[PDB]
């Protein structure tokens, strides 16, 4: 009854017991808590990729970056997080600086809209000037 919702909606002779007398004398040989610690991390779901997508307004909510430059930089970002989660200074499993050329790499940057053009101005903006190009005042 009455379940709360996380996301915004709209505007927003009795017993002699021969059974158990418990006393723990067994150790979990891998360990329960270790598998709990690992399986919580595995329980963490997939991280969203918000980038390059239209927002509620329409404008693509990605930052002003070059797409190959961001695609090279995201390897550095996940590499630094890899070094943080291995807790060593050099991330041994790195995602960049290999010998394998990836110059045609492209990621989903906010430089591009859905039509395939630049996103220097917002598109709600450029439609606002598109209709401001035709008005007529009082005679």
């Amino acid at each position: 009854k009455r379940i709360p919702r996380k996301t915004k909606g709209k505007s927003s002779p009795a017993t002699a017991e021969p059974g158990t007398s418990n006393c723990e004398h067994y150790k979990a040989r891998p360990g329960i808590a270790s598998v709990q610690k690992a399986t919580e991390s595995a329980e963490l779901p997939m991280k969203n990729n918000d980038e390059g997508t239209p927002d509620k307004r329409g404008n693509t909510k990605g930052a002003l970056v070059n797409e190959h430059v961001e695609a090279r930089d995201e390897a550095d970002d996940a590499t630094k997080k890899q070094a943080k989660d291995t807790e060593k200074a050099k991330a041994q499993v790195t995602y960049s600086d290999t010998g394998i050329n990836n110059a045609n790499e492209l990621s989903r940057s906010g430089n591009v809209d859905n039509e395939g053009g630049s996103n220097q101005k917002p598109m709600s903006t450029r439609i606002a000037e598109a209709t401001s190009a035709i008005v007529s005042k009082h005679p």
Binding site: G52, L106, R108, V112, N114, E115, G116, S118, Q120, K121, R126, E129, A130, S132, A133, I134
Partner: protein, 49 residues
């Protein structure tokens, strides 16, 4: 186009966009013009996004 000024540019760029309310010479001309020949009509996409 980029830059702050974007208002009168569409009038100066796309002459067939306007209406032709009267018998002004430019209005007779824009009424004599054809219709489906303004704007984007051919793009060359290679990749998604």
């Amino acid at each position: 186009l980029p830059g702050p000024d974007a208002e009168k540019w569409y009038s100066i760029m796309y002459p067939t966009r306007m209406g032709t309310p009267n018998v002004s010479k430019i209005c007779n001309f824009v009424a004599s013009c054809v219709r489906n020949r303004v704007g984007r009509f051919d793009r060359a996409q290679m990749m998604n996004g």
